[PDB]
């Protein structure tokens, strides 16, 4: 199968250097072009620049020239992406794709066909902490969990152990100025299987190795 | 640089109609090397037409593409569930490559108005320095809504965050998550906490209030 391989998500300070990676399975790596694209948080796609692993030769975008560093290790179908100085504006998704081109070097392009799956960059003050799982007791009912203080993302959350899945809304996390996220897990249920059935959210956060089951009663 | 303007920004269509997505340069792509990509929530692009009209391999037919030099579109004859996602144009054929700001298709569907939900915050959050009060928003259509919130009759501002879920796969409908956080100070200093909602589908803006304490 032809592939192409990201790392894991990164989570650096201010200031701190970073080297992301993208390995190429399933087909001659140093034959084609691989672009790097970035992708902010809730936005769209930019174009960063392309690296031919053949002989090294690197095109940046004029918005990332003086940016970032991308390179490539052709001995293991490898390309990277490089900042000796990592800003909180770095933060966001990064594509490789292969860029199609002709083998015979007559200068056809046939656009990107092959991504990686992202990697997840998030460049931030702040430390790893854990959630504060805090009630949203009822009072149909709806009802939930307030999943707060929390970095870095992500947070899991389940109901009753993955039982309760129907009306179950877990939303996107929201930055807040204090540099930690927060987050709502929700759920509307029928008002009259209040007092019989037991509600409780299943928060998990890795990063921190926190785990809480709170309960939510009226 | 070739800017890449899509319009419009949002399309609502229902499954099975025919969806038209523009991509217009600021100048004449060269070789009409322009690409067609579909990026669907947490998923990668992925490429659907290249060279402005060659149907990337593994693509469906409903998926065609046309455009000459300044103007380019992007058809769907017959959207599918699956359909219903963001699509970017781009350009290789001048450096530097560049993208389209994305165009989101989704699922049209009649006005629904909002369930509204206010939380105080726990007792246990308000031991900690912070009160957060939680207003939702439940099962509503169009993804338009503003939230007001107001703080003994008073309307807030720069407090307050706002989240949405991706429209749902069974009834087309948009949920809101919104939070105003207020010190322990502040929040036992008032009585009134009402979160203001305004959508299509409620004939006046609707209020849901408590008073702080007080059940």
């Known amino acids: 199968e032809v592939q192409l391989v990201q790392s894991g998500a990164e989570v650096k300070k201010p200031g701190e250097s970073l080297k992301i990676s993208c390995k190429g399975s399933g087909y001659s790596f140093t034959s084609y072009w691989i672009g790097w694209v970035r992708q902010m948080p809730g936005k769209g796609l930019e174009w960063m620049g392309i690296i031919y692993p053949g002989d090294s030769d690197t095109r940046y975008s004029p918005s990332f020239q003086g940016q970032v560093t991308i390179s490539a290790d052709k001995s293991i179908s490898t390309a990277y992406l490089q900042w000796s100085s990592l800003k909180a504006s770095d933060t966001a998704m990064y594509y490789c794709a292969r860029v199609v081109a002709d083998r015979e070097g007559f200068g056809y392009y046939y656009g990107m066909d092959v991504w990686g799956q992202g990697t997840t960059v998030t460049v931030s003050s702040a430390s790893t902490k854990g959630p504060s799982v805090f009630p949203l007791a009822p009072s149909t009912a709806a009802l939930g969990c307030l999943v707060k203080d929390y970095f870095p993302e992500p947070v899991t959350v389940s109901w009753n152990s993955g039982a309760l899945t129907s009306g179950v809304h877990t939303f996107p996390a929201v930055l807040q100025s204090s540099g930690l996220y927060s987050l709502s897990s929700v759920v509307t249920v029928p008002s009259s299987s209040l007092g019989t059935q037991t509600y409780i959210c299943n928060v998990n956060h890795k990063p921190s190795n926190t785990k809480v089951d709170k309960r939510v009663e009226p | 640089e070739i800017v890449l303007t899509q319009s419009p920004g949002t399309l609502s269509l229902s499954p099975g109609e025919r969806a038209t997505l523009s991509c217009r340069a600021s100048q004449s792509v060269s070789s009409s090397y322009l690409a067609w990509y579909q990026q669907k929530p947490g998923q990668a692009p992925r490429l659907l037409i290249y060279?402005?009209?060659s149907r990337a391999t593994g693509i469906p037919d409903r998926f065609s593409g046309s455009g000459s030099g300044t103007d380019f579109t992007l058809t769907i004859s017959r959207l599918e569930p699956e359909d219903f996602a963001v699509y970017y144009c781009?350009?290789?054929?001048?450096?530097?490559?560049?993208f389209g700001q994305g165009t989101k298709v989704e699922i049209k569907r009649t006005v629904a108005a909002p369930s509204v939900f206010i939380f105080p915050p726990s007792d246990e959050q308000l031991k900690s320095g912070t009160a957060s009060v939680v207003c939702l928003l439940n099962n509503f259509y169009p993804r338009e809504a503003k939230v007001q919130w107001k703080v003994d009759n008073a309307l807030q501002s720069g407090n307050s965050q706002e989240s949405v879920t991706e429209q749902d796969s069974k009834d087309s409908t948009y949920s809101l998550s919104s939070t105003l956080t207020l010190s322990k100070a502040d929040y036992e200093k008032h009585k009134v906490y009402a979160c203001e909602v305004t959508h299509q589908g409620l004939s006046s803006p609707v209020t849901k209030s408590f008073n702080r304490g007080e059940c």
């Open positions: 060279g402005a009209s």
């Open positions: 781009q350009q290789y054929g001048s450096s530097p490559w560049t």
